[PDB]
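Incident log, structure service

09:12 report received: a user says their structure output differs between two submissions of the same chain.
09:20 pulled the input from the user's history:
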Amino acid sequence: CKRKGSSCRRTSYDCCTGSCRNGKC
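09:34 re-ran on a clean worker, output below:
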């Protein structure tokens, strides 16, 4: 999964923590 502070896609649930907002976690 993605880390908070990394980049993740809008609503693809990519992160383990952090909102995927503005193409970032």
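09:41 both user submissions now match this output. Likely a transient worker issue. Closing.
09:42 reviewer note: The CA atoms of residues 10 and 21 lie 6 Å apart. The chain has one domain: 1-25.
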